[PDB]
Amino acid sequence: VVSAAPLATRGLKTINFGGTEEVVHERADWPREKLLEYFKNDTMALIGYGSQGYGQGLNLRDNGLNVIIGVRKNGASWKAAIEDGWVPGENLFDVKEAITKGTIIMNLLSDAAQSETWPDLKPLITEGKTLYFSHGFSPVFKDLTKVEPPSNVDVILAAPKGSGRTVRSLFLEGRGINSSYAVWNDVTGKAEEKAIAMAVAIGSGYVYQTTFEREVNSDLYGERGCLMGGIHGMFLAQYEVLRENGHTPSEAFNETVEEATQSLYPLIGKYGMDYMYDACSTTARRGALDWYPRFKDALKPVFVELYESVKNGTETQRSLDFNGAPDYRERLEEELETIRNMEIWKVGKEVRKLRPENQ
Amino acid sequence: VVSAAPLATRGLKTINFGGTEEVVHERADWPREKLLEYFKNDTMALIGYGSQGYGQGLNLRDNGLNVIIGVRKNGASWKAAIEDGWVPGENLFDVKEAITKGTIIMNLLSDAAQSETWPDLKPLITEGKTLYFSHGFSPVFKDLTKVEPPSNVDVILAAPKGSGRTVRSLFLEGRGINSSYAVWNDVTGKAEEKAIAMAVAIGSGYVYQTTFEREVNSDLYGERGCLMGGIHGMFLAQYEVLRENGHTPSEAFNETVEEATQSLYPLIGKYGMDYMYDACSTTARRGALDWYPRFKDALKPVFVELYESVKNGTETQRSLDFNGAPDYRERLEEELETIRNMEIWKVGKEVRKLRPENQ
Ligand SMILES: NC(=O)C1=CN([C@@H]2O[C@H](COP(=O)(O)OP(=O)(O)OC[C@H]3O[C@@H](n4cnc5c(N)ncnc54)[C@H](OP(=O)(O)O)[C@@H]3O)[C@@H](O)[C@H]2O)C=CC1
Numbered sequence: 001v002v003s004a005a006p007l008a009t010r011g012l013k014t015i016n017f018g019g020t021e022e023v024v025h026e027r028a029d030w031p032r033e034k035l036l037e038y039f040k041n042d043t044m045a046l047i048g049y050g051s052q053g054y055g056q057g058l059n060l061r062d063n064g065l066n067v068i069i070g071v072r073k074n075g076a077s078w079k080a081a082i083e084d085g086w087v088p089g090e091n092l093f094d095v096k097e098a099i100t101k102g103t104i105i106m107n108l109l110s111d112a113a114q115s116e117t118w119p120d121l122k123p124l125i126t127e128g129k130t131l132y133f134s135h136g137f138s139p140v141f142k143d144l145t146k147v148e149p150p151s152n153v154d155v156i157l158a159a160p161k162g163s164g165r166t167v168r169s170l171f172l173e174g175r176g177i178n179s180s181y182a183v184w185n186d187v188t189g190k191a192e193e194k195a196i197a198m199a200v201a202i203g204s205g206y207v208y209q210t211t212f213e214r215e216v217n218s219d220l221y222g223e224r225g226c227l228m229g230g231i232h233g234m235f236l237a238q239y240e241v242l243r244e245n246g247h248t249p250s251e252a253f254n255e256t257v258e259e260a261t262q263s264l265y266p267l268i269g270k271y272g273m274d275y276m277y278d279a280c281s282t283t284a285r286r287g288a289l290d291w292y293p294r295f296k297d298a299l300k301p302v303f304v305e306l307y308e309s310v311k312n313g314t315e316t317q318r319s320l321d322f323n324g325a326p327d328y329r330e331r332l333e334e335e336l337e338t339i340r341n342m343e344i345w346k347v348g349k350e351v352r353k354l355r356p357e358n359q
Numbered sequence: 360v361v362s363a364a365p366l367a368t369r370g371l372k373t374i375n376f377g378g379t380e381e382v383v384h385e386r387a388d389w390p391r392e393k394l395l396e397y398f399k400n401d402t403m404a405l406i407g408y409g410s411q412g413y414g415q416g417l418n419l420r421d422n423g424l425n426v427i428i429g430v431r432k433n434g435a436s437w438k439a440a441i442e443d444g445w446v447p448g449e450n451l452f453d454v455k456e457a458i459t460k461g462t463i464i465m466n467l468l469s470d471a472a473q474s475e476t477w478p479d480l481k482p483l484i485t486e487g488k489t490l491y492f493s494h495g496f497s498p499v500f501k502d503l504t505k506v507e508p509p510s511n512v513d514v515i516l517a518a519p520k521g522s523g524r525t526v527r528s529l530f531l532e533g534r535g536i537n538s539s540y541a542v543w544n545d546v547t548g549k550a551e552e553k554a555i556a557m558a559v560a561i562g563s564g565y566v567y568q569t570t571f572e573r574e575v576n577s578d579l580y581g582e583r584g585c586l587m588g589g590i591h592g593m594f595l596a597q598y599e600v601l602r603e604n605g606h607t608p609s610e611a612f613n614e615t616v617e618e619a620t621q622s623l624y625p626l627i628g629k630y631g632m633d634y635m636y637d638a639c640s641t642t643a644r645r646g647a648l649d650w651y652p653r654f655k656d657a658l659k660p661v662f663v664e665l666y667e668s669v670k671n672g673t674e675t676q677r678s679l680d681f682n683g684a685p686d687y688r689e690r691l692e693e694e695l696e697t698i699r700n701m702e703i704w705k706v707g708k709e710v711r712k713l714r715p716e717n718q
């Protein structure tokens with residue numbers, strides 16, 4: 001087996017992250033007036049209107065860039081875009097018409113739909129246009145997705161590390177979700193610059209460098225891990241043991257979910273894990289130092305196995321097969337309903353309702 | 360084996376938490392004018408000045424209640440109290456002098472020190488005084504702690520389910536950390552009223568009923584689990600596998616910690632797990648739905664181990680031994696230092712410095 005060329009500083013500004021210098025761009029490198037000048041002849045055609053099309057699109061619109069939306073006419077996204085103020089015929093079109101109008105084509109359809117639609121959209125990404133992704137899913141797993149970007153266009157990526165809903169809300173607050181950028185194909189000598197400028201234009205906080213392959217392996221891993229799948233499994237397991245030993249729902253929920261999200265996890269994020277430890281009792285410190293190695297070892301096998309499911313392509317197959325179905329929306333909502341109806345989340349609805357700021 | 364008596368509704372106001380009625384009190388039940396009248400002849404002597412002494416004491420002081428601090432003279436607590444505006448000889452004294460002046464003795468020493476000082480403090484908690492804890496640790500594990508509260512005083516508990524730093528900061532926003540309340544001994548018929556009034560007076564959000572035994576068991580189990588020990592272990596294991604497969608630190612940290620605390624975990628806390636899932640991509644939802652039952656299954660044995668270590672007394676014994684040492688501050692700090700110097704947390708420093716709100 002073969003190794004991989006490292007990410008290259010190229011003499012650019014860098015930050016030392018715990019022993020590795022990484023390429024990093026910050027908002028002051030791309031102020032609003034500069035972005036407007038840089039893109040003054042461009043049209044961002046944003047294809048798709050999931051939460052990334054929402055957060056990236058509305059941030060581009062607010063920053064004054066010439067952005068339009070392309071989605072299946074009279075589908076769900078179409079109406080969702082209308083209710084965010086995109087006007088059919090002005091800056092909301094069907095997919096083919098948006099691509100004809102745009103110079104930068106932001107493929108923000110579902111990863112499954114990126115594969116399904118690609119035979120039809122590829123002839124429209126002509127010379128002089130730029131093809132943009134927010135995930136390496138489609139072009140990297142070509143054996144399963146059949147997505148081959150044309151060799152005569154720049155192919156760039158900007159990947160916000162957060163929910164599209166928080167890409168929007170943080171930007172409104174003066175904050176911002178971090179983004180990866182990557183170049184998959186550079187034909188002009190400007191793909192990188194466009195990827196970094198795009199990354200700032202969509203409201204990112206800081207931008208750091210990756211590759212399409214690194215990004216898709218990280219992303220697929222994390223969302224299945226602690227970002228979404230792990231944290232939920234953790235909550236479910238801890239809550240169940242408490243309920244089986246007699247603890248009332250309110251007690252078990254406050255000791256599992258509420259204390260975490262309303263107190264301790266925000267301290268981790270504001271000041272780091274040691275600060276959060278030091279903000280709790282000597283008892284909880286002794287207890288937490290005792291048991292985090294036991295939790296690390298219980299989960300490490302699960303994590304190296306999940307990374308394998310990502311690398312070999314199983315998780316990609318799963319998503320292509322489930323989300324590639326026309327009724328994917330209806331059956332995903334079925335499984336979300338199962339989450340909704342678990343005791344722990346029925347209890348959560350009541351706990352949240354009692355918060356002083358919801359009264 | 361022996362069973363236990365359930366919690367008693369007693370025909371009080373109740374809230375249904377997923378099929379269980381629970382005694383819940385709200386701030387509206389104790390308006391500020393009521394509180395200040397109810398406690399007008401009392402003195403809260405608050406013993407200790409960790410996070411809870413800081414959070415509860417300053418909330419009582421700002422609320423207008425007659426609170427004083429009692430801590431070892433010229434130690435760390437004493438220094439911090441003086442910085443927080445407590446005045447020696449006015450509302451800041453040593454432990455014995457404070458107890459002598461108080462009518463409600465809030466024992467907020469470390470759970471190891473509660474056991475160490477208890478033979479000297481017990482004779483000072485005389486008839487007409489009230490003993491108060493924020494943790495069932497001492498009286499419930501009497502065979503290990505040797506804490507036996509006097510039979511002629513009320514003994515009560517209000518346990519804020521969050522760090523004392525958050526008890527303080529939420530109070531200053533008109534929010535609040537929720538509290539358990541419980542009664543160990545009631546010789547007046549007024550112990551419950553007092554525990555609930557204290558829970559509200561120290562700044563709690565809503566107050567639900569528990570017992571001393573139920574509180575300490577769920578509490579010790581919670582902090583060792585996903586509250587502090589469990590979330591740390593998950594972070595370390597997920598981050599290590601990523602670093603073991605070549606991902607840069609900024610990528611591995613963002614895909615593990617930053618996106619979690621800055622984006623997705625706040626969504627869980629504000630609207631529940633299903634809302635968070637629906638705010639993410641169709642690929643993320645497919646993966647999270649495929650893996651949360653796997654993480655639950657891999658973790659639940661660790662949690663049945665944890666609850667048994669809490670139940671039988673190993674955890675309490677562990678904390679009594681380690682924290683009861685005189686140099687507990689520097690011994691605990693040393694272990695906190697290993698955390699600070701972990702690659703993941705050194706990286707997090709630079710990640711946090713790059714946030715736009717921190718410029
Ligand atoms: N968020 C939290 O902190 C929570 C804690 N609780 C409970 O609240 C109580 C207080 O916890 P917390 O505020 O964290 O306190 P800590 O665990 O941080 O204990 C620190 C306090 O203990 C004193 N102390 C320690 N050893 C001794 C000793 N040998 N003799 C005399 N005093 C001593 C310290 O004085 P010095 O500076 O001189 O060492 C200081 O006032 C505990 O029952 C805890 O379980 C409840 C909910 C959560």
Ligand SMILES: NC(=O)C1=CN([C@@H]2O[C@H](COP(=O)(O)OP(=O)(O)OC[C@H]3O[C@@H](n4cnc5c(N)ncnc54)[C@H](OP(=O)(O)O)[C@@H]3O)[C@@H](O)[C@H]2O)C=CC1
Nearest residue numbers: 048049050051052075076077108110113135163164640641
């Ligand atoms: N927070 C996030 O969502 C993040 C996601 N990304 C990446 O951004 C991209 C978009 O994700 P996200 O915004 O969540 O979108 P979703 O995964 O929710 O996809 C929804 C969009 O796909 C369209 N679509 C679905 N099926 C089809 C189909 N058969 N034909 C045409 N259009 C279809 C929908 O239109 P319709 O209503 O008509 O079905 C809608 O516009 C992905 O590459 C994702 O991995 C990047 C960072 C994080």
Ligand SMILES: [Mg+2]
Nearest residue numbers: 160161162219
């Ligand atoms: Mg991600």
Ligand SMILES: [Mg+2]
Nearest residue numbers: 519520521578
């Ligand atoms: Mg607690």
Ligand SMILES: [Mg+2]
Nearest residue numbers: 281284578582
């Ligand atoms: Mg505790």
Ligand SMILES: [Mg+2]
Nearest residue numbers: 219640642643
């Ligand atoms: Mg993804």
